[PDB]
Amino acid sequence: GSDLGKKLLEAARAGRDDEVRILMANGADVNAADVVGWTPLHLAAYWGHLEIVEVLLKNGADVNAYDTLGSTPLHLAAHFGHLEIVEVLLKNGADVNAKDDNGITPLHLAANRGHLEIVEVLLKYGADVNAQDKFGKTAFDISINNGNEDLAEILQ
């Protein structure tokens, strides 16, 4: 742990881009993880802070970091609807078929909160649509149960 890596975790979450910029000027740790495994990319990916996402990735941030239970910044982004972050992350090599410890996939999470664009993007970059979670549900299954017919159609 470091004085700065904690400052970066904080600024990453809060979306203080110039703080992040200055922090990146000083070699603060892009791999600093908080108490639960979240790196500042996680923080950015979750809290919806596109600029910082890029800056971090540009500065050697790991796009396929995973937390105490398997969530990848793609997981967060797909799940909370941050289309642009999804796209950036996948551009920068984010595993679209990452499974957390429940076998949950950014497709699942996106299917579930019903982010049709994010679904298609993930499908575009090759989201395995026949992936199943712990209980065997496929993003389609999430779609039929939530009653989302457009999604159901997209997953054919």
Add this chain to the structure above:
Amino acid sequence: STEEFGKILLKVNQDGSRVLLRDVAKIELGGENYDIIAEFNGQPASGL
């Protein structure tokens, strides 16, 4: 949301099918009671 109420899993059948609440009821925001209906100068109102 009505969406979550509808996916309430009432029972899972012998064949594995899922009877959800939306399969046996209509699920809407709506009046606690439906007794009181006010109009102000003919047009729909509420008030205190």
